[PDB]
Amino acid sequence: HPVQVIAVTGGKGGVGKTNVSVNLALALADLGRRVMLLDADLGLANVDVLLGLTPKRTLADVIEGRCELRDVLLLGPGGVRIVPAASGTQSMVHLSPMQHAGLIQAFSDISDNLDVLVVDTAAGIGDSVVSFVRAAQEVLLVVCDEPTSITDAYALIKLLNRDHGMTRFRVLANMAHSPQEGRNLFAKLTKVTDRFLDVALQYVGVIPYDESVRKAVQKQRAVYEAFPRSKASLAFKAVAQKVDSWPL
């Protein structure tokens, strides 16, 4: 039983990486999978904030040697297991390759009875982002239809490909006003990556712009839980069906 590992990323700030990570995790749990969600925004933790959780200890405690990784695990909704990050601990955003590797390696000790790990990455193209993305089997790029997000997503793809040997990427359009808007967005990325790179982009669909997501964030409850019948939640179910179909 190999664990499916999905890194949710995108370069651009605020495109919905954390919302997608949280609600994809919940949707996969709804399909019957045993799911873990790692907050890899190591110094600006938001997974706990979106879920209204107040972690006593975090990955900060782990790295500083005050506790073991198993000791910081939190229970989220639907049985999802959460690994919480720190908020405001600067050292956590520039960890050595050794510390990053050590952390990733340490997950093998809490891998029991697990089907899927979802990893929520920070904004940007920094070492923490690249380290976690490189360590995943599937790279889910969250993109929205604005020139800055398209530009940032392309930059991250180019970087991961040219410096880190990554050659396959999943693309999810978030805050789309229509499914066709997402397809057109994917078409844009396909043309520029076709022209300059040798990579395989695979489209996963859209999460629509949905006021229910804004309401869910205010409530600090996952939209998938708080508004299970909303268009966004139904779209997360669809993405989960696709993810679950991917070869391990």
Ligand X SMILES: Nc1ncnc2c1ncn2[C@@H]1O[C@H](COP(=O)(O)OP(=O)(O)NP(=O)(O)O)[C@@H](O)[C@H]1O
Binding residues for ATP: 12-19, 146, 174, 208-210, 214
Q: In whole angstroms, give the CA distance from residue 248 to residue 240.
A: 14
Which option in a second copy, ligand X, Mg ion, none does residue 94 bind, with CB closer than 5 to 8 A by kind? a second copy
- 128 belongs to the binding site for ligand X (CB under 6 A): no
Q: Which of residues 185-244 bind a second copy (CB under 8 A)?
A: 217-218, 220
Q: Which of 204, 203, 222 is nearest to 212 (CA)?
A: 222
Residues 122/128, Cβ–Cβ less than 8 Å: yes
Residue 232 contacts which entry, a second copy, Mg ion, ligand X, none (Cβ below 5-8 A, type-dependent): ligand X
Alpha carbon distance, N-terminus to C-terminus of the chain: 9
87 beta partners: 44
Q: Which does 151 bind (CB under 5 to 8 A by kind): ligand X, a second copy, Mg ion, none?
A: a second copy
Asked if 15 and 174 touch (Cβ cutoff 8 Å), the reply is yes
- Contact between 124 and a second copy per CB under 8 A: yes
Q: Which of residues 74-93 bind a second copy (CB under 8 A)?
A: 87-90, 93
Cβ–Cβ under 8 Å, residues 201 and 189: yes
Nearest residue (beta carbon) to ligand X: 13
19 binds ligand X (CB under 6 A): yes
Q: Does 43 bind ligand X (CB under 6 A)?
A: no
Question: Which long-range contacts does 243-247 make (Cβ < 8 Å, 24+ apart)?
Answer: 243/4, 243/6, 243/24, 243/28, 243/116, 243/138, 243/204, 244/28, 244/31, 244/33, 246/4, 246/138
Helix, strand, or coil (residue 247): coil
Which positions make up the binding site? 12-19, 146, 174, 208-210, 214
Among 50, 59, 133, 240, contact with a second copy (rule: CB under 8 A): 50
- CA 45, CA 85: separation in Å to the nearest integer? 5
Q: Which of 7, 8, 15, 25 touches a second copy by CB under 8 A?
A: 15
How many Å apart are CA 68 and CA 106, to the nearest integer? 9
Query: Can you give the binding site for ligand X, defined by CB under 6 A?
Result: 12-19, 41, 46, 123, 146, 148, 174-175, 207, 209-210, 213-214, 217, 232
Residues at the site binding Mg ion, with contacts judged by CB under 5 A: 17-18, 46
Binding-site ranges for a second copy (CB under 8 A):
11-15, 17-18, 43-44, 46, 49-50, 87-90, 93-94, 122-127, 130, 146-148, 151-152, 154-156, 158-159, 163, 217-218, 220
